[PDB]
Design a protein around this ligand. Structure first.
Ligand SMILES: [Mg+2]
Ligand SMILES: [Mg+2]
Ligand SMILES: [Mg+2]
Ligand SMILES: [Mg+2]
Ligand SMILES: [Mg+2]
Ligand SMILES: [Mg+2]
Ligand SMILES: [Mg+2]
Ligand SMILES: [Mg+2]
Ligand SMILES: [Mg+2]
Ligand SMILES: [Mg+2]
Ligand SMILES: [Mg+2]
Ligand SMILES: [Mg+2]
Ligand SMILES: [Mg+2]
Ligand SMILES: [Mg+2]
Ligand SMILES: [Mg+2]
Ligand SMILES: [Mg+2]
Ligand SMILES: [Mg+2]
Ligand SMILES: [Mg+2]
Ligand SMILES: [Mg+2]
Ligand SMILES: [Mg+2]
Ligand SMILES: [Mg+2]
Ligand SMILES: [Mg+2]
Ligand SMILES: [Mg+2]
Ligand SMILES: [Mg+2]
Ligand SMILES: [Mg+2]
Ligand SMILES: [Mg+2]
Ligand SMILES: [Mg+2]
Ligand SMILES: [Mg+2]
Ligand SMILES: [Mg+2]
Ligand SMILES: [Mg+2]
Ligand SMILES: [Mg+2]
Ligand SMILES: [Mg+2]
Ligand SMILES: [Mg+2]
Lengths: 134, 260, 182
RNA sequence: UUCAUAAUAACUUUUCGAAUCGCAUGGCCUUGUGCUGGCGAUGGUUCAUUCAAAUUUCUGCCCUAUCAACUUUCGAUGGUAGGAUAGUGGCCUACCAUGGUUUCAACGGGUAACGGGGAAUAAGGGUUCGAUUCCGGAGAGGGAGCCUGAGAAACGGCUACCACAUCCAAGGAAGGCAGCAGGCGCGCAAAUUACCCAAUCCUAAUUCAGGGAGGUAGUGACAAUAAAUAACGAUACAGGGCCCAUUCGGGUCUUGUAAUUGGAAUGAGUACAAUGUAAAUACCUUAACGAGGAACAACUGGAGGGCAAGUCUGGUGCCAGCAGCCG
RNA sequence: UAUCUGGUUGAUCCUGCCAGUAGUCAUAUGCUUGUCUCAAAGAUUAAGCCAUGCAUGUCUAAGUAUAAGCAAUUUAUACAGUGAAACUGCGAAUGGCUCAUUAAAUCAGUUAUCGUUUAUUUGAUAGUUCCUUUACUACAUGGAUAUCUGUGGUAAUUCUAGAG
């Protein structure tokens, strides 16, 4: 009596982005939310596409449980999904990796420190070294 | 302010872009272009909001960059391009063609219009002058400068730009008893026939307009755009043809045409 | 700098706060319908005052005037859709004749009480507050859910609730577990 | 219109009129590096258009006469010519005229005055407020001066004076929070040195970079919305409609009061998860726990009148104190 | 959202104000405070003073590459890949904050520019640069200059002089 059933309302094709947009209306009694990955797979064999060219987000299990609503897109190919989707969705789905970024404060500090020096820091390092030498 | 202003706060955007007063502090300021920003329509608004083909700014940028939008036969890869009145937006994907004409509520409605007529465009003559070396030229409302026009084309008149070569194909002479469109004020989107054009020596011409429903109003001449001859419009008028049904008549339309 | 969204007051305390007859009437209406505070009666009176202000303003306007027709019948249809104004008196002059008790009667509280699935008004209040009644497979934990005429036929206990058919709940499940263990 | 434009004569320490980049590199055979040749990117004179910017017409401003005349040698009003201006203009100069405003309040003084869209208040007329989410204006400690540019009299641009300051090896150097944080001070009076470009957009050579603009969270009883703190039985102490009224009285019919007594339901909290989000909180959903004095305990004021509710008990006795007023 | 009440008197009818009453996107403050949504917030006095950290830099296939930076592998005898630095170009005059000055001043509505400047965006836009043309680089004219290589100075500052 689980029977998670899925529906795609307001579906619009879109070769502008080589996608198909829709709102995901998932009816699921006696159950919590649908754990996006599982619903991505459900849409994957629903629309005859791989589990990689399918994305869902913006979900909201309505008040009182049961129904839930989100937004979903199905891309014509996995490559188009790779080259059109935001980075954070490509990180959620495991098809990309979180970029090794220093924190914003450190980046700004380093930017100002680079501001202090005109041109490359090659000459100034040796100049300062031989300066404190004497 | 010392110099030009380059930010458009959301509340200050025109109520015809008719965006969401929440979900954003700013609104797309149209870059300089063929139309006044108050009268124009940025491409980002037309795609993200009017068409919903995109979702947000990045999607509109990606759409415009790959050269699928064609404004009047040209690519226009900038996000805030001011696609104004009577411009033609072509998407080779979905092979769809739109012409921007106000719906009678007074808004840039989505008007899917055929490919065959999408070849040309209409324009209002705003100036007729003599440029260098005695060369006559005509300035339309788009800012298009058509050189060597027909010798009896006058101001306030209308012309049919072929939009491929960008030259003059045919034109309509402004005078009484002529199908006409309105492009400003309370009478946005209204379509009618010119009954009289009172001169008013000293400025600010006025014209009286009577529509098919036999309703009558009056509008400024700067506000007026001849669109053809009665019964024979030169373009495909949008749904409703701008009759401006009364609020009670709109309610009766909602009640009568109703199927669920 | 973001465009504000407009909060607005929804009640108005009376100017004479200490009227014996009015206080007794307010307590009567609070006890009859299980109202938590007397701010509820103030809120219904404020809604009724707005309705009456609109009705009187439209009445002042001439008969057969587009404003009168349009907004008068709009208010009429809204009130009959709520159910407070009976279909017999859709005239906009019986709108001025509505009483606060009329809007009190259409609360989801009193409607659950009338249907009989709750045997007491306070029982209706608690049953609503315990996420049991669902107006069309959608629970409403709010007593002041103004039940409209088109949807009153769809009040019943929700499926997720034990009354609509589900697991009983904390106390019953614990007692059953204790009985099974011992 | 001396306009658009055209024409003649001339003038210029003579502006522009592509010595610039990417891709594809086709066709002609004059079969050679030969001849041509597409799509763009940057430029580029002029004229338009757009973003604008400057000025500009009429009308509209709070209090004050214990401010009645104000302005002109130093421009005050006008004329002419010139200079300067991007351009009109006493905008400045030279020479003339002696003019301009005013009891319909000019001029002066005050404003704990930025103007407005608006806010509170509400029978109608109005009164007060509007520093602040939008539009304008002004300012970057107070003042002046200026380079670059299309646009600045810029101040997260410079020069100097004044005020206030900083490092100092005493020779010098460097300052601008009424930006986001935060600190001192002030005062009755107002927040975390947090996360991030996800969303709105903006800038740039331009998708990609950047953005304390902005969004997200932190504090937040400024205000605003909905709303938990119990609900239902079965018992003992009771009350009203009673079959009549032999005293009765069954309680025949119901409604409360009792530390009696039972079974339910549920969150406020915790918490597997998943959703949410840039990532996280939080909300919506939901496992597993989570109510008996359901201690998971609701306060703030008042009980002479105005004004709902005590002439109950004890204490103090015109003290202590209460009292917006009468007391 | 058209309402009044207590107080001058032995008692009355008034004029009158004090007080009561209800607000307040008006704050401050006191006592309490469980939930969801939403949200103002160093304006009033001091436009008073500021430590510290950030708040504007920017590169596309397409301005400049000889980083003696990375890739050296399938594309590589000038160059092609990626790309620091610097020159060039553009923005830095937008945005954000505050209300100190300002009473026909700003501002609002409504006009005007036949009284002017306008990067940018968009649409068009030019044979003559020959000057006596029977002797010219147009199959491409010249010199510097940063970046860089090395020498320093000052206690230090986004201080930079000399050489190639
Ligand atoms: Mg600004
Ligand atoms: Mg001329
Ligand atoms: Mg002059
Ligand atoms: Mg003011
Ligand atoms: Mg002031
Ligand atoms: Mg203001
Ligand atoms: Mg002030
Ligand atoms: Mg402002
Ligand atoms: Mg300034
Ligand atoms: Mg200061
Ligand atoms: Mg510039
Ligand atoms: Mg300055
Ligand atoms: Mg600063
Ligand atoms: Mg600034
Ligand atoms: Mg500087
Ligand atoms: Mg600060
Ligand atoms: Mg901010
Ligand atoms: Mg405070
Ligand atoms: Mg808190
Ligand atoms: Mg409690
Ligand atoms: Mg008490
Ligand atoms: Mg007391
Ligand atoms: Mg007492
Ligand atoms: Mg009393
Ligand atoms: Mg009155
Ligand atoms: Mg007396
Ligand atoms: Mg007395
Ligand atoms: Mg008073
Ligand atoms: Mg909860
Ligand atoms: Mg202050
Ligand atoms: Mg630069
Ligand atoms: Mg490269
Ligand atoms: Mg004054």
């Amino acid at each position: 009596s689980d029977a998670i059933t899925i529906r795609t309302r307001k579906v619009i094709s879109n070769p502008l982005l080589a996608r198909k947009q829709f709102v995901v209306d998932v009816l699921h009694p006696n159950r919590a939310n649908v754990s996006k990955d599982e619903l991505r797979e459900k849409l994957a064999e629903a629309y005859k596409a791989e589990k990689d060219a399918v994305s869902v987000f913006g979900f909201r299990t309505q008040y009182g449980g049961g129904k839930s609503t989100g937004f979903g897109l199905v891309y014509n190919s996995v490559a188009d999904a790779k080259k059109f989707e935001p980075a954070y969705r490509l990180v959620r789905y495991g098809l990309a990796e979180k970029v090794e970024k220093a924190s914003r404060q450190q980046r700004k500090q380093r930017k100002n420190r680079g501001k202090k020096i005109f041109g490359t820091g090659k000459s100034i390092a040796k100049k300062a070294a031989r300066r404190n030498a004497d | 302010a010392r110099g030009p202003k380059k930010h458009l706060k959301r509340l200050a955007a025109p109520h015809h872009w008719m965006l969401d007063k929440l979900s954003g502090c700013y609104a797309p300021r149209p870059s300089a272009g063929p139309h006044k920003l108050r009268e124009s329509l940025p491409l980002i608004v037309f795609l993200r909001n009017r068409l919903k083909y995109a979702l947000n700014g990045r999607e509109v940028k990606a759409i415009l960059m790959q050269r699928h939008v064609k404004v009047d036969g040209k690519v226009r890869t900038d996000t805030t391009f001011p696609a104004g009145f009577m411009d033609v937006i072509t998407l080779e994907a979905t092979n769809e063609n739109f012409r921007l004409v106000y719906d009678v509520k007074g808004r840039f409605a989505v008007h899917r219009i055929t490919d065959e007529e999408a070849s040309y465009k209409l324009a209002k003559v705003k100036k007729v002058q003599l440029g260098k070396k005695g060369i006559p030229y005509v300035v339309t409302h788009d800012g298009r400068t058509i050189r060597y026009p027909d010798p009896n084309i006058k101001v306030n008149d209308t012309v049919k730009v072929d939009l491929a070569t960008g030259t003059i194909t045919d034109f309509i002479k402004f005078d009484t008893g002529k199908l006409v469109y309105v492009t400003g004020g309370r009478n946005l989107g209204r379509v009618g026939t010119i009954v009289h054009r009172e001169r008013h020596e000293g400025g600010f011409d006025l014209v009286h307009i009577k529509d098919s429903l036999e309703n009558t109003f009056v509008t400024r001449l700067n506000n007026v755009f001849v669109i053809g001859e009665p019964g024979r419009p030169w373009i495909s008028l949008p749904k409703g043809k701008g009759i401006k049904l009364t609020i009670s008549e709109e309610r009766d339309r909602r009640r009568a045409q109703h199927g669920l | 700098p973001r465009a504000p969204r407009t909060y607005s007051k929804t009640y108005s305390t009376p100017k004479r706060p200490y009227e014996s007859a009015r206080l007794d009437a307010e307590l009567k209406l609070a006890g009859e319908y299980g109202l938590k505070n007397k701010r509820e009666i103030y809120r219904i009176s404020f809604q009724l005052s707005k309705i009456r202000r609109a009705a009187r303003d439209l009445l002042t306007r001439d008969e057969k005037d587009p404003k009168r027709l349009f907004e008068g019948n709009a208010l009429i249809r809204r009130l009959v859709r709520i159910g407070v104004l009976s279909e017999d008196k859709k005239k906009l002059d019986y709108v001025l004749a509505l009483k606060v008790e009329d809007f009190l009667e259409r609360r989801l509280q009193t409607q659950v009480y009338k249907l009989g699935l709750a045997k007491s008004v306070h029982h209706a209040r608690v049953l609503i507050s315990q996420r049991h009644i669902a107006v069309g497979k959608q629970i409403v934990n709010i007593p002041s859910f103004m039940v409209r005429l088109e949807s009153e036929k769809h009040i019943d206990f929700a499926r997720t609730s034990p009354f609509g058919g589900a697991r009983p709940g904390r106390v019953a499940r614990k007692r059953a577990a204790a009985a099974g263990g011992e």
